[PDB]
């Protein structure tokens, strides 16, 4: 069913002219910031043009399929509803602060471990939920697909190439050189964790896509430095994700029993405040 917006448990009959367009947002991968006139809620709306590129439209619809059946996962962005007009489909998603990539840009430096700990719990539980509940592999884990909001929430973004290929920079060794699969996302999570923890992308000074792949296979996994005060548990987690033999790489169920995960499940970390203060610094 479409033509309904449900926010916080309250469903409102709606059409797209009940929404005020407040402007484009930061994803070319079209999304608008819109305001529900009936309630004042500000939401994100994807506009899928009927006459659009069917390669991209297929991707919007696969992303929407897993989003829609994933409403009981608190670590995946939710869809408030849809509007199917004669010319367009509008997908109303919850509005969040930014992607972890832009956080790294605005921060101009490392993200603290206590924020990465809550993030690591969220993405792992999101990917584990996708595998067990829906048999879905993300295959494109990267900081641009990790979202954060004013209220300390961290959620998996949008997965339009999910299967029941990704960016070459975060691709696992066994996807570069498959000997002949769910552990390929664990590697990209580790590369993203090292990137956000150091403020640098691990494989540095790479000019072409193929050169990045070359250093993934030719060189040792990029682990966390020991002179930044990282906890032993954090380093143990990163080295476990960034294991090069995919058979010796842990599954999600073994990953969730890791001390790093177990600590930040029960440690109250104020992500909301840290997020608002970092977002305050202008450019």
Residue ranges of the binding site:
25-31, 46
The single residue of 140, 149, 158, 270 carrying the catalytic annotation is: 140
Among 255, 259, 264, 265, residue whose Cα is nearest residue 183: 255
Asked if 270 is an active-site residue, the reply is no
Q: Which of 96, 107, 167, 272 binds ligand 2I8 (CB under 6 A)?
A: 96
Site string for ligand 2I8, 23-42 (x = CB under 6 A): --xxx--------------x
Query: Among 19, 34, 44, 184, which residue sits at the site for ligand 2I8 (rule: CB under 6 A)?
Result: 44
CA 252 centroid distance within chain: 16
Residue 106 near residue 281, CB atoms below 8 Å: yes
Name the percent of the chain in helix, strand, coil, to the closest 5: 40, 20, 40
- Rounded to a whole number of angstroms, the minimum distance from the CB of residue 192 to ligand 2I8 is 13
Dihedral, CA atoms, 182, 183, 187, 189, nearest 10 degrees?
50
Site string for ligand 2I8, 45-64 (x = CB under 6 A): --------------------
The beta-carbon contacts of 116-119 under 8 Å, at least 24 apart in sequence, are 116/193, 116/196, 116/197, 116/234, 117/234, 117/260, 117/263, 117/264, 117/267, 117/269, 118/152, 118/154, 118/264, 118/269, 118/271, 119/146, 119/148, 119/154, 119/196
Contact pick of 35, 102, 215, 258 for ligand 2I8 (by CB under 6 A): 102
**Considering beta carbons, is residue 146 or 255 the nearer one to ligand 2I8?**
146
Interatomic CA distance for residues 275 and 136, integer angstroms = 30
Match 């989003």 to its residue by tokens.
67
Closer CB to ligand 2I8, 74 or 178, in the complex: 74
Residue selected from 34, 77, 224, 255 as contacting ligand 2I8 according to rule CB under 6 A:
77
Size of the site for ligand 2I8 (CB under 6 A): 19
Applying CB under 6 A, which of residues 5, 48, 76, 99 lies at the interface with ligand 2I8? 99
Residues that bind ligand 2I8 (CB under 6 A): 25-27, 42, 44, 77, 93-99, 101-102, 144, 147, 157-158
Residues tagged active-site? 140
């Amino acid at each position: 069913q479409t033509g309904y917006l449900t926010i916080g448990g309250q469903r409102y009959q709606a059409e797209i002219n009940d929404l005020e367009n407040l402007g484009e947002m930061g994803s070319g991968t079209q999304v608008w910031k819109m305001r529900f006139r009936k309630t004042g809620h500000v939401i994100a709306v994807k506009q899928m043009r009927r006459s659009g590129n069917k390669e991209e439209n297929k991707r919007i619809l696969m992303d929407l399929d897993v989003v829609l059946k994933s409403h009981d996962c608190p670590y995946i962005v939710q869809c408030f509803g849809t509007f199917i007009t004669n010319t367009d489909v509008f997908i109303a998603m919850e509005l969040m602060g930014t992607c972890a990539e832009k956080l790294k840009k605005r921060m101009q430096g490392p993200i603290p471990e206590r924020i990465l700990g809550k993030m690591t719990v969220a993405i792992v539980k999101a990917l584990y939920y996708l595998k067990e509940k829906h048999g879905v592999i993300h295959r494109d884990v990267k900081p641009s697909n990790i979202l954060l909001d004013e209220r300390g929430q961290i959620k998996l973004c949008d997965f339009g190439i999910s299967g029941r290929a990704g960016c070459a920079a975060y691709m696992a060794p066994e996807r570069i050189d498959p000997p002949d699969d769910i552990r390929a996302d664990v590697w990209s999570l580790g590369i993203s964790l090292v990137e956000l923890a150091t403020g640098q992308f691990p494989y540095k000074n790479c000019k072409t896509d193929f050169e990045v792949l070359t250093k993934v296979l030719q060189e040792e996994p990029p682990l966390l430095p020991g002179h930044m005060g990282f906890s032993g548990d954090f380093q143990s987690f990163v080295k476990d994700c960034l294991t090069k033999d995919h058979r010796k790489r842990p599954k999600y169920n073994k990953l969730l029993e890791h001390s790093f995960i177990k600590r930040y499940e029960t440690l109250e970390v104020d992500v909301a405040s840290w997020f608002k203060d970092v977002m305050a610094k202008t450019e």
